[PDB]
Design a protein around this nucleic acid. Sequence first.
DNA 1: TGCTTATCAATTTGTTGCACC
DNA 2: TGCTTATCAATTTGTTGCACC
Lengths: 90, 90
Amino acid sequence: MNKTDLINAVAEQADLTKKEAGSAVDAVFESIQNSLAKGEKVQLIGFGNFEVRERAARKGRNPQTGKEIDIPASKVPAFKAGKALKDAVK
Amino acid sequence: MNKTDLINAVAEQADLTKKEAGSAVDAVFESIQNSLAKGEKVQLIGFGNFEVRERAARKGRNPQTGKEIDIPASKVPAFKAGKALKDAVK
DNA sequence: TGCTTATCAATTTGTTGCACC
DNA sequence: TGCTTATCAATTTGTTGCACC
């Protein structure tokens, strides 16, 4: 599924036009994104929670030279799936 | 931000009624859940990917007995953040 | 939900290039 | 928007119990 697919699925289930569904879908993920950008958590009952996490510094490898790379600590978005999601997948 | 806030933000940004925004938000979560239930990833440009991950078996510890726990393999929902989202949060 | 054991194990993640990611 | 390095490092994850709602 890509976003176009999701838009079509939403239009069908919510009984909206394609345009309205597109607007709706763009609005949810822009809104989740903007909330995370402010360090604000997003808690979506029946789905899951997004939050910003502080990731510690770590190491990577350069594939061409084989040299170790320093990866500095950074803020990263994380998602915690709710029970409904976990159950359906399992 | 919670689901109610998300619905409100959706109604405003997408120019939809609350009923419509409500239905759309529900349809988004359900569509994602259903796609994952079938093992198919939901890929959203910029934002990231919701996907199904086969988690290998692992080990834990019982906090009261100190005995090792065999954590079996299972399928779990995972989220892989896209570039626009990673950038906006760092 | 949100924190939580360990004289816990070990899977997982993140790294570049690809003129995009 | 997905593949991708490792004769790669090492953070992270995941475990159960408790205490709230």
